[model samples]
Target: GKVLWDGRAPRNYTSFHLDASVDPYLTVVKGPRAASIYTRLLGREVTPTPLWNDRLFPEVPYPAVSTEQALLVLIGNSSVFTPGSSGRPQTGFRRTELIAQVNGSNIDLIPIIGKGRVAFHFSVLMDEWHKLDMIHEHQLVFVEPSDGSHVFTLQVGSPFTNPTGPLPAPRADWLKILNHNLDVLFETEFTDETWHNFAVIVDWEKRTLQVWYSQNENNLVWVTPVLPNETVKRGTAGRGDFHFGILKLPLVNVADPPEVRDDVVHYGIQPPTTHGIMYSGVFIEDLEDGLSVGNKFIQEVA
Candidate 1:
């Protein structure tokens, strides 16, 4: 398949960010932290040490889908987002994400990648130090349209409810791929020290969705059938803004007043911790050719 936008980071992380042509991201999905909330790590480390060095063994960024240096998104206590202007700040949750942008605006690439039979590929891993709290929910990867709804989302931890489930909710540590209707399409263990690669395919014309998955360096294979996604509206409204990172939802703070309880973005129980999510080999490709699998191999999307 023809790769659309590549988010793979070269060893020279600083240089690539400044270069105009390769500006592949927008940081609006961040909190009020003074420093950029993300660090492009070398092949060795997992800590969110917002710096890189040339001396260490570097990650290979060629072939487009290699296990390149990962982008580590670390969210601390201050990780609250205040929208550009009028949009109210998200006070209840802590998050740090990178929105896919190219040729100037994120919306610019949406038209091409959002339609047709295309696959969105991304890989994620969790480190031992900065671990996820299983008690809450995390919407890690998603395509959010203008309507403020996720077209599909990669979820970890328990699904938050008004009253909610027990601490460390059952299967909270499992990773899941859910469609727009909040239907769980596929899932796997969220074990530590391993990489999970996934590709969510959207057949715009047919209004269908499917999923592909693999572990570590294994080539991705289809994990779900082409299921109906009729709820995703047609035309321009159907397109989405691509995002991948940590969006940890707050566990309901029962002691708070009922009126503010359901406002998930502004009130809830979020501890002061620096948790991180590792990501790499993120890109978009079309099925006009074939699916981009592990080691950059191409195979049938069927």
Candidate 2:
């Protein structure tokens, strides 16, 4: 089978969009499980599995938001399987949720903190998928401000911090979650500087951060992975308040746009219609424990 990654077209996101996939994921306490988040593909290309399209697809400009500020963040069980649905109700399988952070109108994945919008980019690499189901649940997250808006967020990466502090029973093993984007599980200290639009990739588990200030998109990468002592948290809580949450979408049969083969202009980039209109607030209810296959209201396409 073709590697089911970066299979969908770019989504014209008005808000936060998280593109995630899983084969197997491990957790420290509750053990590992299949990724619970879902997105869709029906005769159309799904968004890249890792959302990393460097060689082919057109990269979303680092500082895409040319307008106001933008921010994106996520907090929850980190990973779970849910029942999925078609545009019309189906039977088994669940869908993925593409989370995004938006400003009043403009949407930028990597926004200029205190200025433009910063894209909340999340991914589920095959390497990590292989490690799921162990005693370590990885939750990867990114949050910073762009222009005037601040968006703190994450999509299931690592679930625990170090067990240095003693408070709750789980203490260090507490699930790193974000409630409504504002309640940051990890945050960067407030910086009032105009960043020269660069690519920032963070790995919480490895405690490394990479940065790149490339005029050329391909050159965009982390300057170096900075390993820290513990999971870092910046920005004062309650003060840098931004609503954080997740929206579960159904895996509906999307309308496919015409395809253009190998034309340089059309080379790596996919047409917009590959991932069609995502209807929100239609039929959404939170997952209490988790979803399973063959469940009602959820079905698989492939």
Candidate 3:
């Protein structure tokens, strides 16, 4: 497959993270000096000012999907977002995401990259100390299109519903791959010490999606069929920004009034602690050549 953009950190990744110089993306989130990258890729367990610390957020016990290291994203108490366009903060959520940019513009590549047959690849693993609560929702990886909908989402925890259902809902601990219309195309247990690798095949012309999966060092294969995802329109209207990282939503707070209860964004209950999720082998590839599975293996179109 034609490799498009690679966000996998290399051996000499310090310089890129130092200047926020777009090795593949901006250092990202919580503003300047809010996070620091030093001897290791660890998160700060003490203060929330510097999002990333040196001790706890470093390498996992096992090998990453590829490369010498993996990009570890942490969500702390101070993880609030203020868009470049406006001063308002996304207070309803806690997040730290690496936005895909080329010369500081996603629109430049969104057209060409969003169209045609492409695969979005990434490998996810849990951090023992910095894990997510199954009661809250976490949108791990997704394409946030213009209409403010996730074209596809790697979700965990109970999906937030208005009237509210059950706490710690069914399959909350499993990793799910959801299509454009929120249909769960595939799911698997969020096992520990395991690197769950996945690739979402987006056939823009056909308006369909296919799911692929594999474990650490194993070859990725189709876990789902070429399912229809016709809701996402064709061409520029359907294009969206590619984002990979941790975006955790708050649980509904009962302390507030009924009107405030429904406003999950501005008001909710977020546990007073940090969450960590490890990521590696993040890239977008074309299907012209074939799909690049793990272990340096490639699978041809079948």
Candidate 4:
């Protein structure tokens, strides 16, 4: 089920698509700087650039706001509004909606229900990625609990790039933080595979979800989360406060141009090299109550 091959019509590349039985869903995450773009694939999901490019080039072509198009729609605060083209053209969607563009990669969330009204908002919070070092990935899916026995389902695969072999070392603090968050909300423990690709299918009709790991589907995880209830307890509502943020790296780690910072020679210190760099990440939250920061999404900087 991971590959979904129907005689070579090209495989489906949906990383994580949830058909939740509940009303509103939620996503949670952890890391000094991590993020997962949350946007509905109303139509076709474009990769922006090929994964091979990231493997070969230092900088990948990230998604961009469609400028050439006379009109672009951006969803915000549950309202679908289009920015005028004459001045600074607005994104064609709602304000509460979230969109992400990283190294050219991006995700956009849209509202299919609510008569095109009511949309989920997004914001990138942490930007201090230069200090930390690691990889992060997590997921949660709920339907409705069944009696006696049931099924839990999952599908896993590659992401078109050369497998980095396995997931890198995760920050111990991050793991604990995430576990605490889940315990407070879902009140459950996730103890599954530590690495390798997997897909879990829980058949609710029969009340279960089956899980499968990586093969060709490209949704592999080196450090996976722990989910005990894969079926039946399909979460009723999603509620939590997650963040989308970035980190800044020191100059010593960067490859600056010859004259970019040749003048800042204090105390005979060679122009402070970029010892670090900024990276971004995504986090998900599953709260029982509706999301507190509902309506309009924004960039809140102290």
Q: Which candidate is the best by TM-score?
A: 1
Tens digit of lDDT per residue, candidate 3, span 29-124? 543234443112422221111111123334576332223456677787777777675767767788777766676666676875687888998878
Best by lDDT: 1
lDDT of each: 0.78, 0.24, 0.73, 0.20
Q: After superposition, how far is residue 189 of candidate 4 from its true place, in Å?
A: 22
**What residue runs in model 2 are displaced by over 4 Å at the alpha carbon?**
1-38, 42-206, 211-219, 223-302
Considering summed lDDT, which 10 consecutive residues are worst modelled in model 4? 1-10
Residue pairs with backbone overlap in model 3:
41-57, 42-57, 43-57, 92-265
* Sequence-dependent TM-score of model 2: 0.21
Model 3 clashing-pair count: 4
Minimum summed lDDT over a 10-residue window in model 1 is located at: 47-56
Q: Which pairs of residues clash in candidate 1, taking residues 3 or more apart in a chain or in different chains?
A: 1-290
Superposition TM-score, candidate 3 onto the true structure: 0.85
TM-score of 4: 0.20
For candidate 2, write residues 12-41 as lDDT tens digits.
432222222221111111102322222222
Window of ten residues with lowest summed lDDT in model 3: 44-53
Q: How large is the C-alpha RMSD of every model relative to the true structure?
A: 4.9, 23.2, 6.7, 19.7
Native-vs-model 3 lDDT? Answer: 0.73
